[PDB]
């Protein structure tokens, strides 16, 4: 994980500054989701039938 | 009893036979009533100039070029669907591009494949910050009448009902769709909205926990923690860890 750089002094210094600015640590994120589900149901059936 | 079973299979209501000597009179009479009332409220949170998709439903396979050597099956989505792209002006108005749909699966009665009941609105509107706008709707009314009678005997003032057959039907349908935006610019507004919805759900859960499980423990009902409190152990584990 190395960079090999060849350039004159001024370009070298500028490139080293850019590398130093881009070579930094990243933070982390913990992400939590929450799913809630509720269901309710009620029914009634009533009837009378006549037959012969 | 096969023919009699087939004859009585489709009868709804009264079908009564009276014999009066080499002559049978069959009287049929029925009255039917039905009502239906449905409310639905899908919601989604987006950023300005971003697209949002919401579906609650099912994924159903359908034939697109049908044993079988090659069926060409494709899977489609049915349910409650909302696709939205908002655009806030610099102030307090939101321009919305909306595709809204309610669809379910109906069985094929004479078709090659299953059918979809479908209600869809595609449009673009402007709404204020916290106001409601009507997007569309449908009012349907229907009346049907039918009569079959013996020509001259069916008009006698009183005895004519013995020579008539009448059917009447009425149907009414009302459908309406509304939409409502709300702009969140800071953390306090988002916190308020989230707290409202969270506390509603938690209050329902606490009420359900008051009337616990019918033949099990009353503490096994899932209840959300207090707003911003994170999970805690059940009382038995809490006592066990306190003793230890």
């Amino acid at each position: 994980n190395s960079l090999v750089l060849t350039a004159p002094q001024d370009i070298m210094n500028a490139m080293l500054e850019v590398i130093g600015q881009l070579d930094i640590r990243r933070a982390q994120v913990l992400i939590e989701a929450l799913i809630v589900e509720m269901a309710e149901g009620d029914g009634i059936n009533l009837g009378v039938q006549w037959g012969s | 009893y096969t023919k009699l079973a087939s004859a009585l299979s489709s009868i709804q209501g009264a079908a009564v036979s009276i014999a009066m000597g080499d002559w049978t009179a069959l009287i049929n009479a029925v009255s039917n009533d039905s009502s239906s009332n449905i409310l639905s409220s899908p919601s989604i949170t987006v950023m300005d100039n971003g697209e949002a998709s919401f579906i609650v439903g099912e994924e159903v396979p359908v034939i697109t070029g049908s044993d079988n050597p090659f069926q060409t099956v494709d899977r489609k989505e049915v349910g409650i669907k909302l696709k939205v792209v908002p655009q806030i002006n610099e102030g307090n108005s939101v321009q919305l591009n909306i595709e809204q749909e309610v669809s379910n699966v109906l069985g094929a009665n004479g078709a090659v494949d299953v059918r979809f009941a479908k209600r869809q609105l595609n449009t673009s509107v402007m709404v204020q910050d916290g106001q409601m706008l009507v997007l569309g709707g449908l009012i349907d009314e229907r009346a049907l009448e039918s009569e079959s009678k013996v020509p001259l005997l069916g008009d006698i003032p009183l005895l004519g009902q013995l020579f008539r057959s009448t059917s009447s039907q009425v149907e009414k349908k009302n459908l309406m769709v509304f939409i409502k935006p709300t702009i969140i610019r800071d953390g306090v507004t988002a916190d308020g909205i989230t707290q409202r919805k969270y506390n509603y759900i938690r209050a329902e859960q606490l009420f359900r926990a008051e009337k616990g499980l019918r033949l099990l423990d009353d503490a096994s009902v899932p209840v959300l923690p207090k707003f911003g409190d994170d999970r805690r152990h059940s009382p038995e584990i809490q006592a066990f860890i306190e003793q230890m």
Binding site: - | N49, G50, Q87, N89, E90, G91, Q95
Partner: protein, 34 residues
Amino acid sequence: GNNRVVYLKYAKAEDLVEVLKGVSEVMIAAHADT
């Protein structure tokens, strides 16, 4: 003031780029997210 950034209230920037290309002829660009 050789460069300006204009925030649009009601129009879409991608739409106005094509219209303004002819009038400008000068560079015109659109940022869709904002």
